[PDB]
Amino acid sequence: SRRFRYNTKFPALVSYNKLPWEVVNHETPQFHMHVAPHYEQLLTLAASSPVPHIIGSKHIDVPREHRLRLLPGMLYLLDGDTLPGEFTINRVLDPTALQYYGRLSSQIVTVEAVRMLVPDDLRLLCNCITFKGPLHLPVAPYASLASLRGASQSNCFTLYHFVRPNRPPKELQLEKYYIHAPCVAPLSEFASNSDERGNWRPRLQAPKRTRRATPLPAYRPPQSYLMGLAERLAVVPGGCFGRRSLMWGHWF
Amino acid sequence: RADPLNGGSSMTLGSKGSKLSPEPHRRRMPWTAAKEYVPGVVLNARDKMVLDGVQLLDIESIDRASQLDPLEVLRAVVATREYNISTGKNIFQLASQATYNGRGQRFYRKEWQEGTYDKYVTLSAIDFDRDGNKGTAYGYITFHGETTTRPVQVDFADVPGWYMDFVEERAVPFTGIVPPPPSIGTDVPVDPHSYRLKAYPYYDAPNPPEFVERLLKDRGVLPDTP
Amino acid sequence: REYVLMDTSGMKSTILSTELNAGPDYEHYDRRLRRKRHWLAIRHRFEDVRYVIWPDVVEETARGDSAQADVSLTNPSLTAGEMLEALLWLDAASTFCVRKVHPSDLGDKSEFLPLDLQREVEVVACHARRDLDFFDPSATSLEQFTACAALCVNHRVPFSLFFPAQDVCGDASVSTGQCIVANAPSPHTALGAVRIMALISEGSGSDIGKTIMFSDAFGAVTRFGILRGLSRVMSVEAFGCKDALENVNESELCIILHFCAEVREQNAAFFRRYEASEEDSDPQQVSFLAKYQQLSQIALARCKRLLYHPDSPRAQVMSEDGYIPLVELQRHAEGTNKAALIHYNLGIRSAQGMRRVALGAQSSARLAELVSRLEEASARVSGNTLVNDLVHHLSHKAAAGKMSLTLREVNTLL
Amino acid sequence: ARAVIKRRSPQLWGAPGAPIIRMRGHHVVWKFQSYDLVVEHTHKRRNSDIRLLHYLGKHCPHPQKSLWSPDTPVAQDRHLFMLTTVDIDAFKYWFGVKRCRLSMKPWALLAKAGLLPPSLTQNSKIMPKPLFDKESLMRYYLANRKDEDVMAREKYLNYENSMVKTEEERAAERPVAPYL
Amino acid sequence: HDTDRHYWRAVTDDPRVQHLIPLRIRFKIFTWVTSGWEQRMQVVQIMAPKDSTIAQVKDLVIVENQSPYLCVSSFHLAIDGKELDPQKTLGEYGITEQSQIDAIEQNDHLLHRDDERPRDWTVDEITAEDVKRSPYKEMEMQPLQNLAPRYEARPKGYFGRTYYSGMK
Amino acid sequence: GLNGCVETGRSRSEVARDLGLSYTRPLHENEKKQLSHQAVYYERLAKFKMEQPEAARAMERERFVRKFSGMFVKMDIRSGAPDFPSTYRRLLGTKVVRWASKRHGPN
Amino acid sequence: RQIRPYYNLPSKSEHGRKMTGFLTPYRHWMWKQNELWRNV
RNA sequence: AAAAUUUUAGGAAUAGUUAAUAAUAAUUUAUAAUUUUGAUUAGAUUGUUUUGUUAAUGCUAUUAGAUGGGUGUGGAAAAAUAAAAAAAA
Ligand SMILES: [Mg+2]
Numbered sequence A: 001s002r003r004f005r006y007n008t009k010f011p012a013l014v015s016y017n018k019l020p021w022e023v024v025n026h027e028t029p030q031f032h033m034h035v036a037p038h039y040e041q042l043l044t045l046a047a048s049s050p051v052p053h054i055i056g057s058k059h060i061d062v063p064r065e066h067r068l069r070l071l072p073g074m075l076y077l078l079d080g081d082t083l084p085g086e087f088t089i090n091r092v093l094d095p096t097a098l099q100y101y102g103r104l105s106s107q108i109v110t111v112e113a114v115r116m117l118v119p120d121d122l123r124l125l126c127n128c129i130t131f132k133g134p135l136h137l138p139v140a141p142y143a144s145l146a147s148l149r150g151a152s153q154s155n156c157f158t159l160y161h162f163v164r165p166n167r168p169p170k171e172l173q174l175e176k177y178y179i180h181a182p183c184v185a186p187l188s189e190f191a192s193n194s195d196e197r198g199n200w201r202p203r204l205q206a207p208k209r210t211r212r213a214t215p216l217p218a219y220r221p222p223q224s225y226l227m228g229l230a231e232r233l234a235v236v237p238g239g240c241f242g243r244r245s246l247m248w249g250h251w252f
Numbered sequence B: 001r002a003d004p005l006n007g008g009s010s011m012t013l014g015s016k017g018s019k020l021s022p023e024p025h026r027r028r029m030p031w032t033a034a035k036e037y038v039p040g041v042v043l044n045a046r047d048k049m050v051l052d053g054v055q056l057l058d059i060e061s062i063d064r065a066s067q068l069d070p071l072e073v074l075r076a077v078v079a080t081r082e083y084n085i086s087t088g089k090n091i092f093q094l095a096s097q098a099t100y101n102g103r104g105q106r107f108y109r110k111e112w113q114e115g116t117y118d119k120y121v122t123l124s125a126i127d128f129d130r131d132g133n134k135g136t137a138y139g140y141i142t143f144h145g146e147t148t149t150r151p152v153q154v155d156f157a158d159v160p161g162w163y164m165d166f167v168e169e170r171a172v173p174f175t176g177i178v179p180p181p182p183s184i185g186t187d188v189p190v191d192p193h194s195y196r197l198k199a200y201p202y203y204d205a206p207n208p209p210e211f212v213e214r215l216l217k218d219r220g221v222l223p224d225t226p
Numbered sequence C: 001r002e003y004v005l006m007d008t009s010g011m012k013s014t015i016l017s018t019e020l021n022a023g024p025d026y027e028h029y030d031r032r033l034r035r036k037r038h039w040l041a042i043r044h045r046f047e048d049v050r051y052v053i054w055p056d057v058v059e060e061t062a063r064g065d066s067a068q069a070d071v072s073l074t075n076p077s078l079t080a081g082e083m084l085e086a087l088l089w090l091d092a093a094s095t096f097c098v099r100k101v102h103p104s105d106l107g108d109k110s111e112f113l114p115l116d117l118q119r120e121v122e123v124v125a126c127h128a129r130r131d132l133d134f135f136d137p138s139a140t141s142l143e144q145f146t147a148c149a150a151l152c153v154n155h156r157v158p159f160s161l162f163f164p165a166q167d168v169c170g171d172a173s174v175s176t177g178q179c180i181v182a183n184a185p186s187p188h189t190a191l192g193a194v195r196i197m198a199l200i201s202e203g204s205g206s207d208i209g210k211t212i213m214f215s216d217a218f219g220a221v222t223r224f225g226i227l228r229g230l231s232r233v234m235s236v237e238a239f240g241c242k243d244a245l246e247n248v249n250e251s252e253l254c255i256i257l258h259f260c261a262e263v264r265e266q267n268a269a270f271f272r273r274y275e276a277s278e279e280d281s282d283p284q285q286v287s288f289l290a291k292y293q294q295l296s297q298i299a300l301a302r303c304k305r306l307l308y309h310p311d312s313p314r315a316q317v318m319s320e321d322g323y324i325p326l327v328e329l330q331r332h333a334e335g336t337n338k339a340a341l342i343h344y345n346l347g348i349r350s351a352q353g354m355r356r357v358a359l360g361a362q363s364s365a366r367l368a369e370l371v372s373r374l375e376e377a378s379a380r381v382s383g384n385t386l387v388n389d390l391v392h393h394l395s396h397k398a399a400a401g402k403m404s405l406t407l408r409e410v411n412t413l414l
Numbered sequence D: 001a002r003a004v005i006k007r008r009s010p011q012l013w014g015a016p017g018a019p020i021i022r023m024r025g026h027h028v029v030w031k032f033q034s035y036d037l038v039v040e041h042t043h044k045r046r047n048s049d050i051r052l053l054h055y056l057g058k059h060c061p062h063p064q065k066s067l068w069s070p071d072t073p074v075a076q077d078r079h080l081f082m083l084t085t086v087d088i089d090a091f092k093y094w095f096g097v098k099r100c101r102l103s104m105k106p107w108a109l110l111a112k113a114g115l116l117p118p119s120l121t122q123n124s125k126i127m128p129k130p131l132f133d134k135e136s137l138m139r140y141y142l143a144n145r146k147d148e149d150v151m152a153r154e155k156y157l158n159y160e161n162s163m164v165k166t167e168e169e170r171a172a173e174r175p176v177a178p179y180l
Numbered sequence E: 001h002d003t004d005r006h007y008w009r010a011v012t013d014d015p016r017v018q019h020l021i022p023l024r025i026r027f028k029i030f031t032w033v034t035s036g037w038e039q040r041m042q043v044v045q046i047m048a049p050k051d052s053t054i055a056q057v058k059d060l061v062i063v064e065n066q067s068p069y070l071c072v073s074s075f076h077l078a079i080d081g082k083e084l085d086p087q088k089t090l091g092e093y094g095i096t097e098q099s100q101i102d103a104i105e106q107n108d109h110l111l112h113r114d115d116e117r118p119r120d121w122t123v124d125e126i127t128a129e130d131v132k133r134s135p136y137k138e139m140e141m142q143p144l145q146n147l148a149p150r151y152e153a154r155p156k157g158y159f160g161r162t163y164y165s166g167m168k
Numbered sequence F: 001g002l003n004g005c006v007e008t009g010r011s012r013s014e015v016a017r018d019l020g021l022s023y024t025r026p027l028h029e030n031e032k033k034q035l036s037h038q039a040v041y042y043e044r045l046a047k048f049k050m051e052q053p054e055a056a057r058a059m060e061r062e063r064f065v066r067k068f069s070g071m072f073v074k075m076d077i078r079s080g081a082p083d084f085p086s087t088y089r090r091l092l093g094t095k096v097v098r099w100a101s102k103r104h105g106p107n
Numbered sequence G: 001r002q003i004r005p006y007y008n009l010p011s012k013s014e015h016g017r018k019m020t021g022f023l024t025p026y027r028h029w030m031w032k033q034n035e036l037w038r039n040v
Numbered sequence H: 001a002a003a004a005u006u007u008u009a010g011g012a013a014u015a016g017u018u019a020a021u022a023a024u025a026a027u028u029u030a031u032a033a034u035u036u037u038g039a040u041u042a043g044a045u046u047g048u049u050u051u052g053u054u055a056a057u058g059c060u061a062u063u064a065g066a067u068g069g070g071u072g073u074g075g076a077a078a079a080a081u082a083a084a085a086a087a088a089a
Helices: A029-046 A064-070 A095-108 B040-044 B070-084 B091-095 B209-219 C026-032 C034-053 C062-074 C080-095 C118-130 C139-154 C165-171 C176-183 C190-203 C224-233 C250-266 C268-274 C283-308 C325-331 C344-349 C362-374 C385-400 C407-413 D089-097 D105-113 D134-143 D148-159 D167-173 E054-064 F012-019 F029-051 F053-069 G025-039
Strands: A075-079 A088-091 A111-118 A125-132 A156-163 B106-109 B119-128 B135-143 B162-164 D020-025 D035-040 D054-059 E020-032 E037-049 E073-079 E101-110
Touching: A029 A095, A029 A156, A064 C283, A095 A111, A095 B119, B091 B119, B091 B135, B091 B162, B209 G025, C026 C034, C034 C080, C034 C118, C062 C118, C080 C118, C080 C139, C080 F029, C080 F053, C118 C139, C139 C176, C139 C190, C139 F029, C139 F053, C176 C190, C176 C224, C190 C224, C190 C250, C190 F029, C190 F053, C224 C283, C250 C268, C250 C283, C250 C362, C268 C283, C283 C362, C283 C385, C325 C344, C362 C385, C362 C407, C385 C407, D020 D089, D020 D105, D035 D105, D054 D089, E020 E054, E037 E054, E054 E073, F029 F053
Parallel strands: E020 E101
Antiparallel strands: A075 A156, A088 A111, A111 A125, A125 A156, B106 B119, B106 B162, B119 B135, D020 D035, D035 D054, E020 E037, E073 E101
């Protein structure tokens, strides 16, 4: 019969797409929280390695029929803050959403503008991040970002990332660009094509020590009531990071 | 599982600790995750003596017959201000009185500094509800120099007991974005003169003489007499 | 409607020897007698009240038509919408009639057969063309249009009678498929598009070369009406999200691939001419080419998904606008803690029409044939990767005993 | 995990919990009381027809006189005897492989038997608990720190296989005759 | 867990056996030497069946590149400059492992990832999801760290004291 | 094709299927109808679903609603017992009146 | 059983328990000393 | 999940029914299933060497204390009397 074809273990479950709490809304700052680290990692990778199709001469041109099918997942950089047509523009002025770009602005490139483009059918969102100023990180001559005028060093370049409006965060997640390339800035001093080779001297032996380390200030036990033994409470050494077994820096 | 105490040691049930692993033991109760908590009962049981002896007016009632003398209203306002901070100031109460809403400033708990604990949160954004004393605060966490990469929510923000030391240089206008504080060992170079690590992962503070004496007297080693 | 939606859990209608000279047992009335009596009563009531529910129409001459219209306007007892709803429920009951006869059945054996509703279809078509606009671009009216076309095809009544006869005078004579492709509203869902395409295929029994053939022997677009009809059938709103076929099972996928193959075969010269990146200088033709390419690509992607990931959560279907009780239960509850979802175990697996889908035997054979047809005449089916994978899947399932081949599948594969 | 829990006998986790070795007692008068060292679940399986995972032994609380004094006399031969039985292979299997729990009375009994060190609760009032000082502990460790390789070999012999062949055993195992 | 195999068979059945050819496809890449960009050759190894067409070989290359630098853009396969017909098989062209197959790319056209067939797919249909290693690259009885060894806890017959018969 | 494979457990039908043989007794008209009407009913149902969307949608929604609201949706031991009236025959009469008999087959 | 010494933090609540699980810093230090002895 | 063992002085019909199924949530197909080799309903009774007795493979005992609407919680309902039990320093 039909009832005894298989047991009832592991039944078919509704996908996370239908569930509202699973998906992420673009209006909420969680969208920018999810997409900012990917943007900064992509910029770090492009500042040291040539990514083939991360920089284009003009916006990607596809027929309107295939636009909704092909655009999601696309990501590319251009010079200047020109925006694609058929896209209602919404600038992100919310500080709660903007705070997630703070590290990207401070350490990679000063972030100037954040915009969300909603299409006519509200089914293909675009995220445009316009950065002003040269790259803080050193840029290799072979790096992809060396091509951009406003990156290597007006002086503004935009990054466009196409996604779908209501999807789980895995759709936003970008992992193809998590390729680690070395930065040769600390090693450029000793390179043959650098005129600083005869300056540094190798310190091959540790200097003789006549004094020990300065003694730490006398330990003062805490005064306020503590919650208890964090090791027994399975709390990481400061509630932040580490291992519970290797307890350290918690009131003692 | 992920983080056992003393490895796998089942000599007694107490040797496993008050909790087996920091992550929630059941997938259906994420609120059971291990984290540092605060004495919410004491920090929310405010003193009613300040409220006593002063008349109060309910917000709903705006009828004329329920109105009070303006001097009584003023003393009611000051009494409510005292009552709301009797057990300590809130992080929102501190941020409401600072320029740029205290963005870029460091907030720390009373117990985050005493002992080997050295922890503070650098504010990045705050969203007040219609009740300004509550809301949601996002900031960067710095623990013994190491600083997180992204702003996270501040746990027990509404619970009072916070302290801030405002610095005009750290103030960030709303136009810009708060930069994450640099990592003392990673981002900026290590400098023993600027910052010195209070405790390293294998450091244990020496036993205080008062604690040792108390323990010996309780155990009966030292001759404690009335 | 009560008959159609009757709960048939414990019916168990099979021949019992002991009930030769009497009906079913007293305790078996609800099980093995109620549905048969209900449908016989439906048959009798329809035979009694058909001429009342759908009065006979008489066009006569032009003056006779004017008099008939005046009488209808004087006495519009039932409007076209409710008449159509009644006819649809009657057709559903007729299709789901009782078929098995018993020796105890004192009535005629021809009674347990589906009804003939040609006159009722004619009358409802007369009222539909009498009213100014029976069909609307809304999806509900798309469903009504699909139902009307289905009624016409089932009861061999020529279409376009729902529509004003001036178009028929212009086109001399229009077949059911031509009428469907000329008056079909642009769908909003892949399911609606599948229904429309199936109706298009079914309307022309053997004249498929006259209803979807818009090209000449050289590739020039001759009939632009068919081109526009196909263009609005394969709409972006229905095939745009790259997941348009996420709720399409094997039968619907077969329908889609058959429609694509038929279009390509009837317009082979046009496609093989304008697939070489040659501009047609016509926005309509470019849009049609793009829509066809998108439809073919998404259909092939869905077929590959079903073939390579059977029963997986990726290859799961669900009825359109399906009801998920978990969301409603969460919305209408105490949200004190948002991680405390109620009825989680039941609601995670509960959904309307959600079931795992994998390719069967007939489905796999027909899909292999259609994918072979979708390529060129000189294209190597041996080199075609998907066809070989489908054939090997059929062989593997037949050797593992998870399915069996019938003579239809043998004739499809040989 | 229940609406109205069993207040007179609660536990720490759900049923059936981890195996625990305990001395199950009978329901008789004290004069004829005896215990059974058995391993069972944390929650007693008195409902089902299988109650214990294994039966380790029986203990007699009441001491009996030495019935073997006329035999070869040794020191303290004529003191009262407390007879008890204990399975060794099963105990070691459950203790090491299955990693079952352990109560305090079985722990004390096995401490007498010599399988395990004296229990945590077998504490005298003669000396209080030790007081630990981090600096003194570190100084002692620095004074007596063992070699890395020596400690690795010690723990390998204690935990991994202790039947490690020597060069002589390997040479004897190696074929020397015409290899066929 | 329904893998269409409910018995034990150590031998390898004939249907699973496949005839393969170790082809190599070379791409013209550019590396940044101390002076500038210099031309180099990057070789990707594939196992293509003897009865495979040029289109099938191209699809295998796209699947098995496993690098966001070789098959990023559209390309076509040629031998000695002469383009290979994608509708022809390897037998007609006489291609062997010694044959040098070059790939010429078009920068303007970008190769969209339209591959949905898993790289581990075979006739047995026993595909391991979330596995990006090709079926040929890794082959070993690697130890498993996700699970844990399990010993028997419920005894059968004997529980303790005297064995007697054992109650088998 | 008359013998099963002891090594693999395959029955004689599986052995004949693998060998390409055919062991099918001459079927009567009722048996032929049983083997032939499955495709007819499937085609009828598919045609109805593709031809009457509103009726099929209403029927499917009602069926899903009753399935979801059923009291014994959970798949516990009692629901997983192949023969509920026979296995849990203590409940019949006093508590459950759905089945008037505790035995329906040769078990 | 978790010990609740009288000198723990008193919860001035009439709707729940009268004593809290928070402990004085000496109790934390003493508890660690007892933890070390059980670790042996 | 299976196989064997299964009570009554005055012995007969039983039924949300059997199998097949592209059918989870069966609008279909069948010459269906149970039973005089003792069924179903009704009565009695906690099923599988434990008691008593005898020369006895006889006769006579037995709380293995086991299950759909009360919360869909939980890994698992058994969850509102008890039943000698150590439950996170
Ligand atoms: Mg009987």
